[PDB]
Amino acid sequence: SNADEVTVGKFYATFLIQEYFRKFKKRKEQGLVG
Amino acid sequence: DQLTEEQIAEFKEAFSLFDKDGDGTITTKELGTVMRSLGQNPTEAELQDMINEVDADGNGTIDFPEFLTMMARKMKDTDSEEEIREAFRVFDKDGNGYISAAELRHVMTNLGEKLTDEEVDEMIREADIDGDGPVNYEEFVQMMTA
Ligand SMILES: [Ca+2]
Ligand SMILES: [Ca+2]
Ligand SMILES: [Ca+2]
Ligand SMILES: [Ca+2]
Ligand SMILES: [Ca+2]
Asked: Residues involved in crosslink (Glycyl lysine isopeptide (Lys-Gly) (interchain with G-Cter in SUMO2)) (chain B)?
């Protein structure tokens, strides 16, 4: 298989996606006191 | 170079997505389950190849030190185009070259992000530079770039 050549890209992609959501949620919530 | 506790926490959270049973190692079985939930259909050979690429001690699974070594090394690369392309493909599961609100919602729910419906609309809108509705690849690249 040649899947080894895109393996790092696929694991890093899910980090990029989780970060995309995290940064959005952080911007939304910042400063709120419940 | 620096690897802060926050950066490690982000990489641990990425690890935890694939570590479905929470036992501290990623198996081929877990890898394939997650990849199918993300809209892909890799073969057994492709999954084992991916495990083997990261499994530095060769015991057949990926532990977090192995995962962290791989992710920290990729972080040092100044070019992220391949990773952004792969991230686009996760969202664009029907392969038509744009991300719809439904596709973003699907990834959101699979990652347990707990966005409100209005928040889903907002993420799509804020990425939709040309205003035609969905997020195309160029728009996705511009948003994901550092
Ligand atoms: Ca291979
Ligand atoms: Ca596991
Ligand atoms: Ca190992
Ligand atoms: Ca699509
Ligand atoms: Ca658009």
From this structure: 20
